[PDB]
Design an enzyme around this catalytic site. Structure first.
Site, PDB file in Angstrom:
ATOM      1  N   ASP A 194      27.818 -38.896 -26.947  1.00  8.91           N
ATOM      2  CA  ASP A 194      28.466 -38.821 -25.647  1.00  8.91           C
ATOM      3  C   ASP A 194      28.803 -37.370 -25.335  1.00  8.91           C
ATOM      4  O   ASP A 194      29.426 -36.681 -26.148  1.00  8.91           O
ATOM      5  CB  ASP A 194      29.741 -39.683 -25.581  1.00  8.91           C
ATOM      6  CG  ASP A 194      29.440 -41.134 -25.325  1.00  8.91           C
ATOM      7  OD1 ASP A 194      28.341 -41.404 -24.780  1.00  8.91           O
ATOM      8  OD2 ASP A 194      30.287 -42.002 -25.666  1.00  8.91           O
ATOM      9  N   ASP A 225      34.692 -43.826 -18.664  1.00  7.80           N
ATOM     10  CA  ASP A 225      35.477 -44.609 -19.609  1.00  7.80           C
ATOM     11  C   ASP A 225      36.939 -44.347 -19.298  1.00  7.80           C
ATOM     12  O   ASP A 225      37.335 -43.194 -19.129  1.00  7.80           O
ATOM     13  CB  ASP A 225      35.179 -44.232 -21.076  1.00  7.80           C
ATOM     14  CG  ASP A 225      33.772 -44.603 -21.508  1.00  7.80           C
ATOM     15  OD1 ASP A 225      32.948 -44.945 -20.633  1.00  7.80           O
ATOM     16  OD2 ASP A 225      33.470 -44.526 -22.728  1.00  7.80           O
ATOM     17  N   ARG A 249      28.476 -42.700 -16.759  1.00 11.74           N
ATOM     18  CA  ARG A 249      29.507 -43.716 -16.717  1.00 11.74           C
ATOM     19  C   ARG A 249      30.862 -43.045 -16.757  1.00 11.74           C
ATOM     20  O   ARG A 249      30.975 -41.831 -16.925  1.00 11.74           O
ATOM     21  CB  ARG A 249      29.359 -44.699 -17.885  1.00 11.74           C
ATOM     22  CG  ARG A 249      29.604 -44.109 -19.245  1.00 11.74           C
ATOM     23  CD  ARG A 249      29.543 -45.184 -20.337  1.00 11.74           C
ATOM     24  NE  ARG A 249      30.304 -44.782 -21.525  1.00 11.74           N
ATOM     25  CZ  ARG A 249      29.809 -44.074 -22.538  1.00 11.74           C
ATOM     26  NH1 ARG A 249      28.534 -43.718 -22.531  1.00 11.74           N
ATOM     27  NH2 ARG A 249      30.591 -43.723 -23.553  1.00 11.74           N
ATOM     28  N   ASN A 292      30.884 -37.413 -30.486  1.00 12.34           N
ATOM     29  CA  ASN A 292      31.372 -36.865 -29.226  1.00 12.34           C
ATOM     30  C   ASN A 292      31.139 -35.360 -29.258  1.00 12.34           C
ATOM     31  O   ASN A 292      31.851 -34.627 -29.947  1.00 12.34           O
ATOM     32  CB  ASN A 292      32.835 -37.214 -28.971  1.00 12.34           C
ATOM     33  CG  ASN A 292      33.096 -38.730 -28.928  1.00 12.34           C
ATOM     34  OD1 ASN A 292      33.653 -39.321 -29.849  1.00 12.34           O
ATOM     35  ND2 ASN A 292      32.624 -39.363 -27.868  1.00 12.34           N
ATOM     36  N   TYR A 339      26.872 -40.886 -34.755  1.00 13.98           N
ATOM     37  CA  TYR A 339      27.738 -40.990 -33.607  1.00 13.98           C
ATOM     38  C   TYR A 339      28.483 -39.681 -33.490  1.00 13.98           C
ATOM     39  O   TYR A 339      29.032 -39.187 -34.481  1.00 13.98           O
ATOM     40  CB  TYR A 339      28.715 -42.155 -33.757  1.00 13.98           C
ATOM     41  CG  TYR A 339      29.839 -42.187 -32.752  1.00 13.98           C
ATOM     42  CD1 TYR A 339      29.592 -42.084 -31.396  1.00 13.98           C
ATOM     43  CD2 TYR A 339      31.141 -42.386 -33.160  1.00 13.98           C
ATOM     44  CE1 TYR A 339      30.628 -42.155 -30.469  1.00 13.98           C
ATOM     45  CE2 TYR A 339      32.180 -42.456 -32.249  1.00 13.98           C
ATOM     46  CZ  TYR A 339      31.923 -42.347 -30.911  1.00 13.98           C
ATOM     47  OH  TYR A 339      32.966 -42.429 -30.031  1.00 13.98           O
TER      48      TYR A 339
END
Lengths: 145, 144
Positions: B128, B97, B95, B51, B49
């Site tokens: 992301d 957030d 998207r 960013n 994961y």
């Protein structure tokens, strides 16, 4: 630029397998030209270009003015595309762009995920997502965001 | 949260048509839980994961601790996914957030394009891509 550990050769640039995917890869390669007039010919009249979340350019004229202004102050030194794929009319590039600021000589690696919408092979939308913290310093222009 | 002018119904979230795309949307709706322990159940053991370009988390323990820490100082109030798609074993989400900082109560709209890799229905990779200029101020933690 080294291939990240998460790179998947199933989605590699060499494996592009649609006309839209192949045009986008060609357009990635042309970015090192730093020639707004050459790049603009990839774009439909009804188009848009945006590095998020900066103000978008809509229409061919605005996109060309934006690119030409960017090329006044920065050189795209390298574009390395790790992943390209496509889905539901959209093309996705996971990539790194090497940008060098012309007044300074400083270089910057930007990790970028970009989405492209093509219509009859021309770009109708182009949106790059990446961190802008160093984009302000890299680009000797106010980015209006 | 307005639908952008460039949104294409052809790739809208309501049109998700693979198992992997359906799981990723479920994981999107689960983000508002702010519960690292409910979210980690979505992840395989070998996973990551990130960013971008912050230091990535590899392994399910590190991903859990990264989320748990994030949810200590920030709430995920809303997730609107405009586009979901997939290609060559990757799923993509375009998207927005809505993030709210806990110590300040300031909210923030982050425009995000994310890529997900899933093996046997479990997340092996999640990156992301978004602008982190306000993310520093948004999360009350060193970004490294």
């Amino acid at each position: 630029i080294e291939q990240p550990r998460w790179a998947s050769k199933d989605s590699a640039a060499g494996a592009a397998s649609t006309p839209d995917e192949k045009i986008v890869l060609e357009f990635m390669d042309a970015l090192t030209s730093n020639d707004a007039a050459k790049l603009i010919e990839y774009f439909a009249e009804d188009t848009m270009y945006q590095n998020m979340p900066l103000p978008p350019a809509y229409g061919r004229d605005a996109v060309e003015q934006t690119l030409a202004g960017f090329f006044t102050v920065v050189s795209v030194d390298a574009v390395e595309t790790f992943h390209i794929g496509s889905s539901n009319g959209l093309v996705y590039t996971e990539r790194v762009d090497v940008l060098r600021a012309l007044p300074t000589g400083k270089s910057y690696n930007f990790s970028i995920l970009g989405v492209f919408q093509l219509t009859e092979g021309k770009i109708t939308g182009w949106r790059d997502y990446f961190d802008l913290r160093e984009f302000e310093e890299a680009v000797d222009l106010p980015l209006r965001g």
